[PDB]
Copies of this chain bind each other. A is one copy, B any other.
């Protein structure tokens, strides 16, 4: 009532910081990059030591690339399945702790300054198989947990299809499932029954290996939670054609009557022809988008938060005739928009998505992102072309946003600086606080941390001040990517200086 006395509590009725608005920082590091003797990083001791080091710095987020089974080139983005984990991340030493291997069975260490997948597979897979076999042949607590995992409806809704798909793909010599004999191609019940009988061992071992992955990943996730670290995963909007995701869900994709894609993914200008099948969004509507709901439920199972690559495809997507050799001959199609996210909310509750929204995007993309409250991205490596309206410049950043120095698709800051255009360089020198070129990565890190963006993420390569040899991926190249590992001599114990320097900057910019 106007003019009357307030209660005496008035003076303590102060604004409270919303815990959901807490400023934070983190590190982008894929677990393949961890040090160790078995040819690849894994979910063992180095994952826990990394989490400890991250906690020591004051960082509270760890971002990974997709954890799916990669292709032969190591790519997390050409996954063999959208929901399975990369079994080569399984730690042999952790299997010893679980009693499925004995210490004596572990292999002699190998030099692998970079990940060679074929070498890691040859070394580790026989032992992961032996552990899985011991698991299925036993009858204890661990076997009982395997059964709970296998019979859990939110696991079984993708795992059985994944395991049958893999067993068929293992048994058949064929390019893709389009070439499979009709009863297998089209999942006839008695054909699938016959596959279970004839490939029973393969199927049970595949499922056990997914269990072992789940168990180890979940231990890592819990450990991160215990040390005040959230994990942010990565989910590409599209899935590959030759996958259980498509084969077991044909009606949910734009395929012809023979199961061949009608239209494929890409972006216009030469633009890019990615060549993935496209979702049949109208068909998906008819079962309240169950396929996407299930995918998000799996993402929730693995990660605290998730980046979706090419988030713009939910508003509008480029569709290329499947017979085309290039992208420029396609059409833009209307995406599902907020009705998809409404269905997800109804199905799964609150989600934490990060929209990858880089490049030329349309007004509908921005409106959709805002309507669901998702942050977009700023990337400082992109800030110094054009004028002062570039959205990647700090003064243009938004609070509900994730700022990066760069992503896995960019060179390291040092490498980027090396090849940078003179006009962009002179510009960067005005915006950034730069001392020696040796320390350019720390200039950019400081600019990221000084941002109003609620979350700042730095690649481990930039914290280590590494050059172009440490770049994780060069887009559109098909060899020499995804192999970077933390140098063999750099232990998390050897990074106290870097931790102190990070912590000092987080303190200064209110991210602790």
In the complex, chain A residues 361-380 whose Cβ is within 8 Å of any chain B Cβ: 361-364, 366
Query: Which residues of B sit under 8 angstroms from A11, Cβ to Cβ?
Result: 268, 332, 360, 362
Which residue from B2, B13, B336 sits with its C-beta under 8 Å from A337?
B2
- Shortest Cβ gap from A369 to chain B (Å): 11
Interface size class, chain A: 35 or more
Q: Which residue of B lies closest to A397 (CB)?
A: B452
Q: Is the beta-carbon distance between B13 and A363 smaller than 8 angstroms?
A: yes
Which residue from B16, B335, B393 sits with its C-beta under 8 Å from A2?
B335
Q: Which residue of B lies closest to A337 (CB)?
A: B2
Q: Which of A39-47, A89-97, A221-229, A279-287 lies at the binding interface?
A: A279-287
Given contacts A3-B281, A394-B450, contact A362 B13 (CB under 8 A): yes
Query: Which residues of B sit under 8 angstroms from A507, Cβ to Cβ?
Result: 388
Q: Is the beta-carbon distance between A360 and B281 smaller than 8 angstroms?
A: no
Query: Which residues of B sit under 8 angstroms from A268, Cβ to Cβ?
Result: 11
Q: Is the beta-carbon distance between B388 and A333 smaller than 8 angstroms?
A: no
A451 at the interface (CB under 8 A from B): yes
Q: Mark A421-441, 1 if CB is under 8 A from B, else 0.
A: 000000000110100000000
Query: Which residues of B sit under 8 angstroms from A512, Cβ to Cβ?
Result: 388
- Shortest Cβ gap from A305 to chain B (Å): 22
In the complex, chain A residues 312-338 whose Cβ is within 8 Å of any chain B Cβ: 316, 331-337
Query: Which residues of B sit under 8 angstroms from A407, Cβ to Cβ?
Result: none
Which residue from B3, B362, B387, B510 sits with its C-beta under 8 Å from A14?
B362
A300 at the interface (CB under 8 A from B): no
In the complex, chain A residues 333-370 whose Cβ is within 8 Å of any chain B Cβ: 333-337, 339, 360-364, 366
- Shortest Cβ gap from A357 to chain B (Å): 11
Main secondary structure of the interface of A (DSSP, over half): loop
Chain A to chain B: the 9 pairs with minimum beta-carbon distance, closest first: A388-B510, A3-B282, A6-B332, A10-B332, A13-B362, A2-B281, A3-B281, A15-B363, A5-B331
A-B contacts, 25 of them at CB < 8 A, read A2-B281, A2-B285, A2-B339, A3-B334, A4-B333, A4-B334, A6-B331, A6-B332, A11-B268, A11-B362, A13-B362, A13-B364, A14-B360, A14-B362, A15-B362, A23-B395, A388-B507, A388-B509, A389-B510, A393-B510, A395-B451, A395-B509, A395-B510, A433-B433, A452-B452
Sample of 16 more A-B contacts, CB < 8 Å, known A2-B336, A13-B364: A2-B337, A5-B331, A5-B332, A6-B316, A6-B331, A6-B333, A10-B362, A11-B268, A13-B362, A14-B360, A15-B366, A17-B389, A388-B509, A389-B510, A395-B452, A452-B452
The interface of chain A, by Cβ under 8 A from chain B, is: 1-6, 10-11, 13-17, 23, 268, 280-282, 285, 316, 331-337, 339, 360-364, 366, 387-389, 393-397, 430-431, 433, 450-452, 507-510, 512
